[PDB]
Amino acid sequence: PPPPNWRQPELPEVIAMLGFRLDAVKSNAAAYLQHLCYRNDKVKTDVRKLKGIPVLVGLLDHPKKEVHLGACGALKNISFGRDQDNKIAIKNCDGVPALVRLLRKARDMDLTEVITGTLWNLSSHDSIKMEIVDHALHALTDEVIIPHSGWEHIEWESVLTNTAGCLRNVSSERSEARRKLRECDGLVDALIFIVQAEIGQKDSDSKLVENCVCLLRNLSYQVHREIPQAERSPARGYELLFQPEVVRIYISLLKESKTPAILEASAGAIQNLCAGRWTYGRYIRSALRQEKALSAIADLLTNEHERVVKAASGALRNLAVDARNKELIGKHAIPNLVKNLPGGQQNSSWNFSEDTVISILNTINEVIAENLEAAKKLRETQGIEKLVLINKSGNRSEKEVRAAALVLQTIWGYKELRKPLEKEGWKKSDFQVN
């Protein structure tokens, strides 16, 4: 008679075993399935085609943790990878509601970790974002963010990380998503609280901080137009997005963090809060044009990472629009901006992409628009050489050449900068905008 043995069943058998009466077979099959899918795109795709996904999703409702946790670990692996149809299939058999239903029942960290990791994987697909925003938002906030944040101490850092990563992804575009998240009771409060807690533990680099700050940057995007009754008793809810404290947090992250994505996100949130014409935008821009904050922001211009350089540029740009210590911005911004243009000894700026260079040029233009001393510091840093090098390039694009001409035409507006170039033989038409 037939002893037990180590034979490997075929995929279709494993999938059928998901429906065997014995819970222990279901759970071992789900587990084995998770293992088969691990780092194996082809297997993930075959599971979809064999119609395993709705089976796995059905098992989330199974009362026994071994089965539902087993099914979930498999879905997590299946929700990861290049075949985006695997994520869509999970959505199409109501995987998100099922994940959410299980989340509300979960009592343990390991299961909550797997559910939220799966949601984080799903949230990267654009077609699943509003599904998650509409069906998981409130469970993620009420079951995870608020209780584990410490807000009313911090714990379950890994689950919080997954969960903020998920909310960050789904809020990466769509005003409807930003508005829905901004409106969720306690969500903004607790994110700010988490980021403060971490900074207080001397953690300014964790993925948790990263996900929270990126999320906060998303919610700060267009807050001035999207806040209910844009018309602008303590601040609460989305009002916290533009109070002094969070602004101070971004600035402190600019000084303490070494992680490019966190520096970019913090500079980005500052940029977003500074973009709008509205009372709070004025307050925040005015506060940010002080010596310490300007230096914190300008210093990211010496960061070796392009995307950080670009973020600093955008932030500096929005500060310059209504600036009033013309000397200040000028002093803090111009030398580092000019260093990041091609045409000197800094190798890296010869390798920046077109969008970065245009960002810097536009920012330069804004900073010198009515600021003779800024224009002078430009001239003093050999930045005219660089503008001409860009403008007269035989290899850069029309947009980049034009961006350089714009700055040149602004420079041409000032008599004191004009006469010295005329002494070289330059005339205004050498630098036409087209």
């Binding site: 037990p4 043995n5 180590w6 034979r7 490997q8 069943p9 058998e13 494993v14 075993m17 222990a24 077979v25 071992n28 099959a29 587990a31 084995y32 998770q34 293992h35 899918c37 691990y38 780092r39 670990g73 498999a74 997590k76 692996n77 929700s79 990861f80 990878g81 939220t116 990791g117 799966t118 949601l119 984080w120 994987n121 949230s123 990267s124 990380t161 997954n162 990563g165 992804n169 990466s172 993925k207 996900n211």
Partner: peptide, 18 residues
């Protein structure tokens, strides 16, 4: 966007799969 959930390997008892 980042699929930060990632993927994990798993344990199982192959002998019970029949």
């Amino acid at each position: 966007d980042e699929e930060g959930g990632g993927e994990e390997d798993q344990d199982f008892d192959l002998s019970q799969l029949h």
